[PDB]
Amino acid sequence: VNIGAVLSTRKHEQMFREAVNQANKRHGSWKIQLNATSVTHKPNAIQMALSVCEDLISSQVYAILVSHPPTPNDHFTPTPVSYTAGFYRIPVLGLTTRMSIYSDKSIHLSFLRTVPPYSHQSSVWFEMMRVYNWNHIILLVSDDHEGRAAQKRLETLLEERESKAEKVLQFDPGTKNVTALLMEARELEARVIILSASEDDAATVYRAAAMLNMTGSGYVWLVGEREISGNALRYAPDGIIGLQLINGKNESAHISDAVGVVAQAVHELLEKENITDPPRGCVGNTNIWKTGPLFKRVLMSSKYADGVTGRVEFNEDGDRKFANYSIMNLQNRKLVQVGIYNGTHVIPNDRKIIWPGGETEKPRGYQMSTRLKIVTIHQEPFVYVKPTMSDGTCKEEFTVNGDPVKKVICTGPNDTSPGSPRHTVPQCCYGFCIDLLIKLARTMNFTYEVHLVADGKFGTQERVNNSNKKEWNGMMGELLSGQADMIVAPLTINNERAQYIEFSKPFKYQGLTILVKITGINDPRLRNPSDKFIYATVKQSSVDIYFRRQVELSTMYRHMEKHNYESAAEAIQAVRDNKLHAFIWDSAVLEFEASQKCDLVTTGELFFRSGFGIGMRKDSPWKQNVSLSILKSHENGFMEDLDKTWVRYQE
């Protein structure tokens, strides 16, 4: 029942003596007979470790307490005591340090604390983010050692929220060239600055942002416990969200809470059976504590009914119990406060949140980024690739119908992939998708960046690798990341192709159609292929997913996967010159081929009638504008004009 302690300052020793003298048996009901002893920390790390190894484990101690700020290791962490007591499964109370790397159960077997580490701070930040729908955030963490674990936890929680952030990487510890990333963040979704570095590493970023006037509206600064103290309050903008946990700042209150937790743990241990003493660490003794895993379970895997904090639902890692927060605001270094976290959900206090932008309501955090990468993909019915007339200048033509043709400056290859590998000549593209892009550009103002992608494949998930992981490729892999979220292409939403992101309203329902030289699905010629029935369609398209879902065309899939070409210009030129037999694509291409060529039968035999929606990101504030534009185009007379100009175009 002997309990030890290791402090450095006399005030901590006096507080521990008072705590073990008075109000020591109040925790619980059993009359404890603990023998509390304290060891003064030595200025040298080796001498103190030797004193620990010769006193604590020799006196058969059960728990300790390390809360002195001036550690002899000059690193603000109890390194020697922990490295010496970890062998005997001793619960080293590391409440003096907040390093999330030391709180991990990987390198430290028995190492608990009563101070929220960087992981708990990141969890609280993530909980505060989902309240105001802060999905696309940026992380400006400059620290490396604990910053890596912080950003890993952040990205894992973002993936668990069915989303993905944009900036979760570090740049440099304590740098001054953050002007580029700040200017890039000036045109992003949210201005929520996530900084979880040390004092100087955060002060450098603060002064660098102050030199660039980065103190506008919408900048939600999330700081930790020891990030703004002494002089970092001036470099940081006035109005930062200063997190603070109960009994975290006051040393006496923290020591009292730790003593109460230790008393509750000892009482819970005495409640059950198997009350054994740790092996005495004398010379030649290399015994392991038998009740080590059980002690870890009763510490972190169980709950606490009483104690100093008087809360329940203790964390499963022994870092910090989820309780009420005391987050105080620092508007010009005053006593103002913001919404505190009450362990399960943030509850607003009497005075609402004050923001540095100037107002008190919800600031302009969730801002629509004007930089929208409009990736252009080569399509057969809509995109008409042709060399540009003038150098860097397109001539908008006008057909015999009532819809004008607007050519966009599509920067990309001038021809298909087999023709040229890749070009950077800004040719002219025009089509239904181009007209929709022009309508969206003239409706709402935004900086569009058009660029023609090289490949023309959709990039399904049938035989792709994607760094040996299940993700999308081609032009859809960048959509989930957040770079090119607006794709001007009629993506058929009929299967798990669109289970991650939601598309817009389907504007066409033509579906898919086969070509004849196989006149219908009921004919055995279409079901059972042959040597001449070639199915050289676009590789990794929706037809592949449709054939994977259907189980009656197993003999057809064998002559389908090994025939799909990567490009489509060679395929359409072959099927036009009487080389291919079956080509499953949209009805507009077959209609145009039948209009321009009379030798082709073009029976159609279309029976899919699937919808065609514009590919857009699910979590984005621009997916509603696309639906509104589609609805306006449908209710107006432009629908039949676009149809007669693009789909049913006769020459």
Partner: peptide
Amino acid sequence: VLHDKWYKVVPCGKRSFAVTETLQM
């Protein structure tokens, strides 16, 4: 299953959807 039982013979059951473009000429 009881509803989709007397639809065995279908001259233009699954061919009626081809109305957007030209048929076999």
